Every structure is written in C-alpha cells, then in structure tokens.
Amino acid sequence: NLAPLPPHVPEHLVFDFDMYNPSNLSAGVQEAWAVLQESNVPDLVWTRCNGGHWIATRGQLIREAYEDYRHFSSECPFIPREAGEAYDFIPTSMDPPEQRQFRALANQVVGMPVVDKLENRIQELACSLIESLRPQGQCNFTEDYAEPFPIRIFMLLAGLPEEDIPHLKYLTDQMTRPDGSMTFAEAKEALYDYLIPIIEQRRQKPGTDAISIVANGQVNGRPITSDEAKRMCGLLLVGGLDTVVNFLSFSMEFLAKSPEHRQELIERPERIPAACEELLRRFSLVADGRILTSDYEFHGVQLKKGDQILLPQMLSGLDERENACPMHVDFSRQKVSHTTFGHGSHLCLGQHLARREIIVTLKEWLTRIPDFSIAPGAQIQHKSGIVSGVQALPLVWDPATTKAV
C-alpha cells in the first residue's frame, strides 16, 4: 500500500496518487488524473504508492524533465521500479547519443514513407470493418473495431499471423495495465520467447516485413545483433497493439455523447485534422517516467540519485496554464498544446501511423454511421496504467439512419 517516506522528502510534498487506481476513476481517467492539478497540490509531489516516486504535475516541468536526459534517464522508465528495471526495449531504454542510431532504424519501419505506402490498406480495412457493422445497429466498439482495426494493420506490417493476436495482446496489456496475473519481467520473457524464433528465421531468410528489416538492419556501421533486434521488435509490438486501440475508444465514447461535435465534423470535413489534435489533447492516455542519474535540485525540490519520477504525458494538455478550459472539447482552439506523443529525444515515431488511423476512422465512421449513442444503461469504465484504456464501449444506432457506400 503506502511505502515509508524517504528521509529527503518534505512531508508537505506528499500526495498519495496511485497511477494504477486513481480515486476518481469513475468520473473518467483523464478527470481522475487531473486532480493532480488542483490548487491544493504542489507542482512536484511525492506519492507513497507503488513503491514511492515523484510526479511532475505541470506541462512546464514535464517538458523540462523530458528535455534534460542528463539528469532524467530513460534507463528505468516504468514504475514500479521492478518494471522499470526489467524494461530493456530499444530505443526507449536508451539515452542519447546511443539511442540515435536505433531510433533511425525503427524510423525506417514505421516512419512517414511506410504510412504513405500502407494508406490504401488502412482505408480499405476501415471501410470494410464499418460496413460490416453498419446494418447491425449495435456493437461493442472496443472489440468490434478499436482492437481489430489497428492490430490487423500492424500484424500486416510486421508480417505476423492474425491467429497470434489474442496471445500477444494479453501479454502487452500486462505490461501497461498489470492485472496482477504476472510480473512485467514474466510478461516480457513470454513476448521474447515468441519473437526470438521469428527473428532467427528472418535473419536467415529476409522478407519485406518490418521484423525482417529490423533483424537485418545496420547500426553504427555494424550489423544489429539478435538481442538488439529482439528488444526493438518488443517495443514495436507494444506500440502497435496497445496505443491506438485505447485512444479510439475514448474518442468514440466522446463522440457518441456529443451530437454537436459529430455534426460539426460532418458539415465541415476540413476540420477533421484539427479535431484529431484536440481529441489527442483531451483524451491523452500515456504516463511513463525517468530515473535520476544523480542528486539534483529541480525547481526548489531536492531529488536524489535513484529516485524515479513520473512525468505524465497525459497531463501537459490538461494543464490550465497551457490550455484554457482544458476539459472542454473545442475543435477550433487557436492553439492545441500537448505532449501526447511525448517530448524530447523519445518523441513517438509511430505518431504518423496513429494520426492516419484516427483520421480515417473519424471520416469513414461519420460517413456511414452519423447518428449513434451509448447503449441504454451501460456504464463505461476506464482503466489506468502506463497506457490508459476503456473496458468496453457498447454502442447502439438505428440502421435506417445509416448510409451505405
């Protein structure tokens, strides 16, 4: 439960927030985390939950810490410590200048050029999935669209069979929103047992898939090793299977409850990209951290070497000092400020793929199914963790109001 306060922590900086089970979760996960920004809470606090760790609450401190890799290292990015220590994914667990070489290779596989190439399949899969659901008049969005749409596209990119989805998805979820059924290390090992054989095969007989490209890539002049390949692909898996999936659900949940926002996107399509940024701001869902490389005084607070600090990317855009009326969704804000895809040297490489998948969903869904809402008597429950999610999203609609294409 609560760990004993360390000697160097002033007790007035204590605020016991549990990132895996915040108190007001019933009101929404973003709302639950936003309590960290109430006037009674200092900008930098220490929680005794999950082993004890700091949490920066303002977009300003979050950006700073993310830029200063000298004091805030990526080596142990996950909390609790045990997870941050077992964490060895590349390029994430590396600090510059080492990260740089690996980031470039990962970029080759999920960067802009790959997205432009996959565009037609993304579009195709979206239209197909939506059209197949359209006449039914109901669906559980999380499992009927949010999961298959992003995941199948990734399985297509990586060259992995759809049959492995259930297994891989389970392991991934244990890493971001631990059930308690298994430790991060055990989750990490199982994913690795899966990847190792595949990597071996693709080193011997290269294909055009992302895995073959990584497994045979060159880093710093020499060839990548199997271990380095295994660790980079491990990261790609977690990113492809547990990010866009959850985000689509928060957005769709909001849309089902706000006819005014749906209509806006239907009558003025040129707004969709702007809407996408705003939804990414309001429904930001990631929260990881860094480890202190040495004693350091950050904004008047003395941090000691070894201290882990949670720097919630989710909070930057919900900060009122950053965005006026943060909880209000406004597709016409003059400036949408956020760090949803991160900040600093570890800025999300898969952000282009994410945005394309989001915009395609919005446009294609609103075209065929303009009017829809949350099923009567359904309680939507969110879940918190390194990456937040929606448990299930029961949606209902009148088929007679849909348009086939």
The annotation places the binding site for heme at 348
Map residues 349-378 to x or -, x wherever contact with ligand HEM holds by CB under 6 A.
xx--xx------------------------
Please pick, from the candidates 173, 253, 277, 288, the single residue that binds ligand CAH as defined by CB under 6 A: 288
- Give yes or no for residue 340 binding ligand HEM (CB under 6 A): yes
- Give yes or no for residue 214 binding ligand HEM (CB under 6 A): no
From the list ligand CAH, ligand HEM, none, partner contacted by residue 198 (C-beta under 5 to 8 A by kind): none
3-state SS assignment for residue 38: coil
From the list ligand HEM, ligand CAH, none, partner contacted by residue 313 (C-beta under 5 to 8 A by kind): ligand HEM
Active site residue 348: yes
Number of residues that bind ligand HEM (CB under 6 A): 27
Comparing CA positions, the residue from 98, 97, 1, 81 lying closest to residue 306 is 81
- Give yes or no for residue 176 binding ligand CAH (CB under 6 A): yes
From the list ligand CAH, ligand HEM, none, partner contacted by residue 176 (C-beta under 5 to 8 A by kind): ligand CAH
Please pick, from the candidates 278, 288, 307, 319, the single residue that binds ligand HEM as defined by CB under 6 A: 288
Whether 309 and 56 have beta carbons less than 8 Å apart is answered as yes
- Whether residue 273 is preceded by a cis peptide bond, meaning omega within 30 degrees of 0, is no
Alpha helices for 68-111 (secondary structure H): 81-86, 98-110
Strands (E), 190-285: 218-219, 222-223
Per CB under 6 A, the segment of 125-133, 190-198, 241-249, 323-331 that binds ligand HEM is: 241-249
Residues written for the chain? 405
Active site residue 100: no
- Give yes or no for residue 253 binding ligand CAH (CB under 6 A): no
Strands (E), 94-251: 138-140, 218-219, 222-223
Within 10 angstroms of residue 369's Cβ, the number of other Cβ atoms is 22
Active site residue 350: yes
Characterize 143-157 residue by residue with b for buried, 16 or more Cβ atoms within 10 angstroms of its Cβ, and e for exposed: ebbbbbbbbebbbbb
Per CB under 6 A, the segment of 150-158, 232-240, 275-283, 368-376 that binds ligand CAH is: 232-240
The torsion defined by the Cα of 247, 249, 251 and 256, in degrees rounded to 10, comes to: 180
- Give yes or no for residue 92 binding ligand CAH (CB under 6 A): yes
Q: Give least dist CB 284 to ligand HEM, A.
A: 7
Distance of CA 302 to the CA centre of its chain: 30
Q: Give least dist CB 93 to ligand CAH, A.
A: 9
Q: Give least dist CB 373 to ligand CAH, A.
A: 30
Within 10 angstroms of residue 28's Cβ, the number of other Cβ atoms is 19
Determine the Cα–Cα distance for residues 278 and 204; give it in Å rounded to an integer. Answer: 45
Active site residue 402: no
Contact residues toward ligand HEM (CB under 6 A) are 77, 91-92, 99, 103, 106, 110, 235-236, 239-240, 243-244, 247, 285-286, 288, 313, 340-342, 346, 348-350, 353-354
